[PDB]
Amino acid sequence: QVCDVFDIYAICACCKVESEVFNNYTFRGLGNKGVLPWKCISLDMKYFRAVTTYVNESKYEKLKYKRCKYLNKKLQNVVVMGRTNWESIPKKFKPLSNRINVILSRTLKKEDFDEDVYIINKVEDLIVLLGKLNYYKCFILGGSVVYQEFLEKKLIKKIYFTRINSTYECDVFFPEINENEYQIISVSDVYTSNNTTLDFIIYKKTEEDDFVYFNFNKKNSIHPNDFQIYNSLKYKYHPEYQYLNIIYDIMMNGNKQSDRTGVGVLSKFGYIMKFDLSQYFPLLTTKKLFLRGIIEELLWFIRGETNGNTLLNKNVRIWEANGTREFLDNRKLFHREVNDLGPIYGFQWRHFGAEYTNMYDNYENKGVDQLKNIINLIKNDPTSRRILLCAWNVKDLDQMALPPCHILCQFYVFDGKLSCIMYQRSCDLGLGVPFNIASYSIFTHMIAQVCNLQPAQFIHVLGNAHVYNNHIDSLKIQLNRIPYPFPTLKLNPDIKNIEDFTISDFTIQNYVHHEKISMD
Template sequence: MPSESPVHFEHQYLDLLRRVWEQGDERRDRTGVGTRSLFGPSMRFDLSGDAVPLLTTKRVAWKTAAREMLWFLTGDTNIRELVRQKVHIWTDWPLDRYRRETGDDIDRNAFEARILDDDAFAARWGDLGPVYGKQWVSWDTYVPAGEGLFRQGEPINQIAQLVSDIRTNPTSRRLLFTGWNVAELSGMALPPCHMTYQYHVAGGRLSGMLWQRSCDLGLGFAFNAFSAAMLLRMLAQQCDLAPGELVWSAGDAHVYLNHEHLVHEQLAREPRGRPVLKLNRRPASIFDYRIDDFEVHEYDPHPHISAPVAV
């Protein structure tokens, strides 16, 4: 008799989605929408053979997630470049601030058009504060300047340091970076949700762990898991290692109450196919990848499921 095919990677996500919806603690949250929440779940994804944890029970705009990851690595914190690439996932936060502070009930299309056309408007209203990319590649430092004063020192590029450390000290327990800069949280449009990444080298394979303080399972997880796998593949390529496992874990894993339709529809679908992520070239550094360096093959997902973003 033929052996049974291995369990599809996506079932662990669907099991968690069901468990959070059926057993999660229902609570009011920062957005006012409300969630059902569980604390401390984890999942493991094998990335060998170019496998990638790209959900198939709904279509995921993986190129949008990839463009966002590449944007993080530039250190940019203004939505203008994302909007220029037709990536809208960060627009709601500055748009909400603009509406609150000006009283102008502008729609998103008009707001983004002004971001692209007006330098001064983009500088003021497109800025997200010191979010992910700023902390990843330009973490501020301060050095004594005499008489109890301090001046700004050289910023720390955590990603460049990580690549160097993986290459030169692969058994280190400090192969990590974080976006959780306590001193700058109040200035961020959104404090980092996918906040700490740690890596481990064994047997010529690079594995990674992503810890999220907060994960929107209905919308955010699909992007978070793909992006973390993509970054791990980039790091492995730059460090002459094979990809190992991606370990995902969360503090507060939740489903928004207005995503009930998404939960039921997605749980009614069966995962299909096993997508793979191909890297088309090896750039000179981790910062030189372009969107056309990535291709996803064998991806035949179910249709997209629309759901609102809670701001």
């Protein structure tokens, strides 16, 4: 194949388009009025320059042989542009440096250009030219017209595709990719550049003995084909893979166990995930999540409330099952009013060590206001190793509707940035953990803002990590979905106190996600 001999690749950047169901075609905006739809995304420019300029000397002779054999016979890449594309580039950036420049045109000829460029009036002439040049790889840089004809002709080996996770006015579009001709093989980390998130995906046309020696000493009824898309990917660098890889590990290596609930689980013990909150908001994209409930739940914690009715009256049902007459009696809380959850999170955060009475009592200035103390440590003693918020009050556990899953939060401050570790004793990977990542990520943003810091890392440590048997088929589906670039979280910047946030102070922007799943 011509694309394999001549190593012809496409590289593009696509945004979302002004016009909700999401698919790969969501990212299709290329240009507007003969220029880019966006002002400048410097990180995509950096990636573009590195990919289109990189060559490997030592690998060239193998390519020279391949092309010689097919034809019967500093190193640079070739870059090919449409005439309209060429005319969009600033004079100061043209011809593209350290690359062989090729322009496709009928209306213009070599006499129309001052620059060191090749003009070709036919695609077939590109193939003849590549045959005559010494070069590493050939990158098609666009036009929409140019992409459309090179894909149509099956002359593209791989598409290096930037997903720009923001919406702009566009008048030219990247062609809809055919899933039977091209499949994603690699997905990068998520980044922020110029107030947008983005990632980089790759579509593909559809001493060593000592290592084996040290391997001389190498469970569950999971089938290979069950994870075909998941295991087809070469580079899984998107941070959502920290979640998906743990699910995979428990399904393949997990220990079959009963639990408190009767469903039985697969379980393992001890994991860590790390999310860079400076670069993205880690709301899972491989299924739909809504945050209104978990934001109302965090605001209720911060107020120190234990009254379940406060959440039910906001149509948030997260704690409804744990406040029922039946549930409280099964906990031996016979003298507890329905939806009186006892001295759970909010109470421990604002009043640790106070005697719990009922959900209506005024606990002002009783027990330890841990939340206030950690905000004061972050502001006045930021190098403190003692900046911890702890919900696990051993004395009060049997008075709680249930003992907390999120044991503690520890904070770390360096160079004006705030990082948070949350330790979770018990982690429902299918249902709970996706919400728990979002909760503590929002909380990190809130604590950073009220202490005049920038959020850095949310670090999630999982103790007993389990998949419920009734979630296994739903997670097999989810694991074969390719994550989308993450959204971003914005807070009202006028909020200066932890107690002053309300639901309208939080916006999730650019959330692109796969379809809702019922885990059950």
